[PDB]
Amino acid sequence: MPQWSYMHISGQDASEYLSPGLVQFARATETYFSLNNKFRNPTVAPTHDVTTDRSQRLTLRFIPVDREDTAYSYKARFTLAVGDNRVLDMASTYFDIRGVLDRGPTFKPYSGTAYNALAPKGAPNPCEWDEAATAEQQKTHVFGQAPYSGINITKEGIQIGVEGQTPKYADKTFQPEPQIGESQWYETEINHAAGRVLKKTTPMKPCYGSYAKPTNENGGQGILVKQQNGKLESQVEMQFFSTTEAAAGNGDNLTPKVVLYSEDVDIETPDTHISYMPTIKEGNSRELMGQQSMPNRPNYIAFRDNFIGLMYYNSTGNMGVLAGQASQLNAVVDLQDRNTELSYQLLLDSIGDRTRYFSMWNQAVDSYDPDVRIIENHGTEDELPNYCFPLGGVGNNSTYTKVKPKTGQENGWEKDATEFSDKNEIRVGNNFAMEINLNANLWRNFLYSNIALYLPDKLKYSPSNVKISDNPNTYDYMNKRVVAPGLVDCYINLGARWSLDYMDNVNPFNHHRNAGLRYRSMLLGNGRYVPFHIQVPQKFFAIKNLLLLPGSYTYEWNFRKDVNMVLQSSLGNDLRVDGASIKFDSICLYATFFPMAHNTASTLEAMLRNDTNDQSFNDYLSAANMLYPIPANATNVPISIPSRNWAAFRGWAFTRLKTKETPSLGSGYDPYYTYSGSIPYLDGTFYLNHTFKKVAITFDSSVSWPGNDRLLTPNEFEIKRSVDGEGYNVAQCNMTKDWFLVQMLANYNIGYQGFYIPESYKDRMYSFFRNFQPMSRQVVDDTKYKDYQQVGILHQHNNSGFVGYLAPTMREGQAYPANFPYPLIGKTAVDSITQKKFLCDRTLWRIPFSSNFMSMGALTDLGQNLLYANSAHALDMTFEVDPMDEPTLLYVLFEVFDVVRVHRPHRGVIETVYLRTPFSA
Amino acid sequence: DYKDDDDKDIVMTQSPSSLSASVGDRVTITCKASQSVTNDAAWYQKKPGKAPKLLIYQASTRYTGVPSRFSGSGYGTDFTLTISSLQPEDFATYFCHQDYSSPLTFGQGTKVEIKRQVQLVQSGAEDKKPGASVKVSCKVSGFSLGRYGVHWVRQAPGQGLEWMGVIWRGGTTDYNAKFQGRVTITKDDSKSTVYMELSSLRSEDTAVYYCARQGSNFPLAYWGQGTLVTVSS
């Protein structure tokens, strides 16, 4: 058009329509006087060869041809139809799955309780009980409250108002209401009081956590009884009371000063349990008024990160299928040495930022609070005392009469009751008050909630007079096991940055502060009954990015139903036993097509059917996976590979797993899998890297690798050393110079020209430095401190008289000088030793098969050298690790090439050539 | 209607005015206060030369070293002083007194005529012309001025006893409004002396001026020697 080019909507850029001398001038003055923003530059979209003009759907929905179901799986068959002059990117495809989910009775997406949270945890509800008479003869005792002040009390109840001349009485079904009482702080004469009380027939439960559903629209909870005529009727019964002194009188003066509305209710404790059960005897009693409640542990339950586990991968028995209708041959070739899920995890990390959540794919990385993993104990800022005061601001007082002086005398005084009251309330001295250390309490609560309750089960004990399951994998067991707060109190490693030794080997991601798991639990909702509707992506490396040319194709895949696989819980309890169930109602397949111009689509199809233009992909992980059993408490882990070809071997990577948290894939269903926590093998939530000591690599036999006198200790890879006489540790921890150098080179190629912090983009979530956490602390020297004394938790007393004894129960004992912990600071500091260690979560240990350990090219220089390229070699690796009281696994990834070439010669045909070297099929 | 008006002078009305008596006779004097003083009535005996002597206090209590023949009675508004049997040493002029309220007030004083340790020392007497001022001293011994306040009273010829003011233990002064702020009382604790300064003298201020001190729980009981101040044109 004419005016567009003039107004620079269209036309040429500023560099082209301006004076050449001015453009030259602008380039010269750019650095100190830019003129770019002064002149418009047009941007024009192409008008032809891009988009079609005929009617064309952007999204196709395919309902499955055939669906089969077992108890633990279900396979769906789709006929993916790519029409002519249409082009489909498999990245734009996903399965739309809908069903009903039941997370079960162990799902608790919150801490604390929903009911009477502010109530003191030992305070009972207004209750009654039968008790031995003793002056069988029994009598009923009442313990209650009467907050409502009424007009009068007759046999018709408490008078709550008047309707002209008629007195109005409380509707027993909901009046008086328990949340109503006096509106002023100071005392008043209440000659006609009323309240509600629970009958002796209703079990005794502490107020904290008490819930009784309502039986009427006005909030009444009185259980209704079905009468003969078939109508429901209230069983609320009135109980009148007067003072014992008043009942001593003859009787004519006898009148009730209190009326309690006694009722039965369906009490329950949905989200709390009993922390102190005084007696095993069942039935209401005065003793049972002392039982204390405690909120049930939080247990978030959701679908896994990136919907890990929903789709079968790397399972020969349940292999996905993509094929052309014509050719019966399948394009998918899956192996059990492949790890598709973990590959997708690390791939996603390499591409983008895993800290960001994307609801569609359940893309929310598993994580843990850093201040929970490593405790950084600064103590508390409690310099100022904190006080609570009387609601009146004064407290108890005495009554005083005013007096006035005899103004003509030295010290004469006279009563003055004419103008002033003789009962004036005055308190002499400071007001009444109580004291609390708020920050100390908050710190203590944090430690007990996030750390103490997660200690290994060997440090807990079974509650007294409370039934508990026999299965340690159940929520009931994890919830009722008692941990004493003194194990993780305010004074733990005070002033150190130090993770508890007992917690190092505990999966930090099985925690209620796992932000990712929590987000994925709340994406479903806050209830256990959840109708869900989700989108599941294709992760197999050969397909997920394939560009499918016209033709029809069978796309068939298998899916899991195992709650322990498809669901994830923060506590890891066995969701099979704990009542979780899932049902997949329907499934569809959605494919998004570029509305490509038909001439362009045909030309591109033609170009892509040629041999030279076969599409090629490879697994990001690019490794063959091997798991070697490490029996309990074993430190030496020997493994050997028979003589074979190593051409293109890229290197080793390894970490350590727990057999409990690692399911046996390929079987289709693991009957011995009793765990619903994170699965590091799949999601990359590794956390046992610190338990490695050293690795010995021996090619063939007697040939050490890398040898050549390279390392400070050349025969073996020394990861960490306990007290190095040589002084080969680094970075103020127990890691070796050799190992640190190797890892820095493997991850960033830094070692040889100085050590520094890698660039952020190079140091990602699963990188080494990002997760490298060295730590040190001091501890009493039991040999050199002459006054040492071993005082277990049973006889430690710090904050005695203000905390519970060995339980999260109530205040107990007396004030007394502490006997624990030993002071490591100040004039009286004890002789101390120093312990160094480190943590390295999420990352993998890397030994690249490179001459200088660097990354100069995927195909390592050693992967090409003559020795390993034109000969066969057997391998013998020996890992020395820290002992652990349960079976573990050595996870070794043999870094190789895992490539696939994909050829589409004709419409509806698809051929694939798979190669993985070293370690071929 | 009926409410004892405080912050208003309490007048002690003494009856009769004069009396003639013989040794052995019984004498009775009465005092009527403008308002109740509970039981804060005291009777003093004064002879021309000597200073006042406390006889009765709190209506019915005999001060220390007072013969048995003296007795007091009454409460509120009415009080009575009776001598059961006169004796030549008792011929003097007796004064009603109240310290329930400030200003302290005495009665007009009755005249008994015939029919046929703690120490306070004042400065010397003096005299001056109208319109001028005086400063009188009162050296104290036997007690601390931080424990007691010192009052100043005067007796004008042919008149009763006039309470002038007081300086209390804490230094707070209280003056008789009758003097229109002419009186100013000071004290030096170091020198243990009390000063009383009167201004704008008039010929009617010709009087004896007495330094005085009360007890912890009984009225004025310790007096100075008296200082005669004369004023004439």
Author numbering:
A (entry chain A): 6 to 140, 161 to 946
B (entry chain B): -7 to 108, 124 to 240
What does the paper say about this structure?
To explore atomic details of the hybrid particle we also determined the X-ray crystal structure of the scFv–hexon complex. Our high-resolution EM and crystal structures reveal that the scFv shield binds to HVRs 2, 5 and 7 of the hexon and, through multimerization, masks the other HVRs, thereby probably blocking the access of scavenger receptors, which are highly expressed on macrophages, present also in lung and spleen. Notably, our structure of the Ab-hexon complex also explains the recent finding of an ADIN-escape mutant of HAdV5, carrying the single mutation G443D, selected by directed evolution. We speculate that the insertion of a negative charge in the hexon, facing a cluster of negative charges (Asp32, Asp58 and Asp91) in the light chain of the antibody, introduces charge repulsions and steric clashes and thus reduces binding of the antibody. In order to assess possible differences between the crystal and the in situ structure of the scFv–hexon complex, we performed molecular dynamics flexible fitting (MDFF) with the electron microscopy (EM) map of the shielded capsid. The high similarity between the two structures was also reflected by a root-mean-square deviation of only 1.5 Å. To analyze the stoichiometry and the surface occupancy of the shield on the viral capsid, we projected the complex structure onto 6 asymmetric units (AUs) of one triangular facet of the icosahedral capsid. At 18 epitopes two towers of neighboring hexons are facing each other, resulting in a clash of the respective scFvs.
HAdV5 is the best characterized adenovirus and a promising vector for gene delivery for the treatment of human diseases, such as cancer or germline defects. To increase the affinity of the shielding scFv to multimers of hexons as present in the virion capsid, we constructed a trimeric scFv by fusing a highly stable trimerization domain, SHP of lambdoid phage 2143, to the carboxy-terminus of the scFv. We therefore conclude that the trivalent scFv provides a high-affinity shield on the virion surface, most likely through avidity effects.
